[PDB]
Design a protein around this ligand. Sequence first.
Ligand code: Q31
Ligand code: Q31
Ligand code: CL
Ligand code: CL
Lengths: 148, 149
Amino acid sequence: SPGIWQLDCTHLEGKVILVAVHVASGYIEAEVIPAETGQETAYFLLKLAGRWPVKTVHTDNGSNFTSTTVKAACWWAGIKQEDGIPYNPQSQGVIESMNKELKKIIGQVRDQAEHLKTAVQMAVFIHNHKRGYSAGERIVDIIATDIQ
Amino acid sequence: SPGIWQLDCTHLEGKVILVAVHVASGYIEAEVIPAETGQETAYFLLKLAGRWPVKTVHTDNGSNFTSTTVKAACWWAGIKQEDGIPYNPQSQGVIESMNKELKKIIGQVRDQAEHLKTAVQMAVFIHNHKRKGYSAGERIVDIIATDIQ
Ligand SMILES: CC(C)C[C@H](CNC(=O)Cc1c[nH]cn1)Cc1ccc2c(c1C(=O)O)OCO2
Ligand SMILES: CC(C)C[C@H](CNC(=O)Cc1c[nH]cn1)Cc1ccc2c(c1C(=O)O)OCO2
Ligand SMILES: [Cl-]
Ligand SMILES: [Cl-]
């Protein structure tokens, strides 16, 4: 479980928000992209895997699962690509709830940021810092425990 | 020390590579940008602070230290902005050495990536995973975990 991440793609203001969730902790990383292509997803995963020990990724849809560029990035970074099928159906609800929460935070920071990308990063910050421990605290503890 | 980061700006292929180094561990995050503006630096810090517990940042130069946008981002994120003056002069050598190492890795991945930004992220990966023995990635997690307890 310490190396398991889930991809999540949500939409806002005619733009695409790509999210990676560390399943065990609820910690996230996110980016705004023009559209969800294999290339954008692949680049996002390369960034993620350089920053955290990503062992397995549950991909968000079949197009990214199939993408040769995504497969290339997973090979390069030592990531096992898996499907994101919610065999446990409560999975979908948790993700949907997070997307709602994230959009809510984004709305709350609109007097502060001119650009959506900035608001998304503010939302990442607030999500990861929210307290009981925070998601940021949980991911560090989970990984540290795993190293030692 | 667990919350202390240093900004570092280096140049390659007529482009700018902005780097944040976690001082105690040597762990890095980096991005390619067209040029080093206050706005780009500010955005970079917002990203960083959402991902790791950034308490203090030693800024890479006076323009970013002065920048109202950088100051706004540091205020927003709860970051103490400090200067990056190497009072301990060995500081500067360590950074220069890392920049050399990073450029070397970037050169080694040029048959693999079409775009510089991709090569930089590959270099971040290799740097953070490299065993010295623990890796920088392992060190930062241990340092922060120890601090939470
Ligand atoms: C830290 C924030 C509180 C402020 C900081 C600067 N923005 C403003 O001051 C806009 C404003 C607020 N009230 C009236 N105008 C946000 C920011 C930082 C860096 C960026 C940005 C933005 C952005 O605005 O999206 O865009 C890409 O690089
Ligand atoms: C995982 C890598 C080994 C490959 C992957 C795809 N690139 C190629 O296949 C180029 C090629 C042709 N012949 C040899 N290499 C890199 C990559 C991924 C995502 C991106 C990229 C790039 C990039 O190339 O910069 O640009 C922005 O989004
Ligand atoms: Cl790592
Ligand atoms: Cl954090």
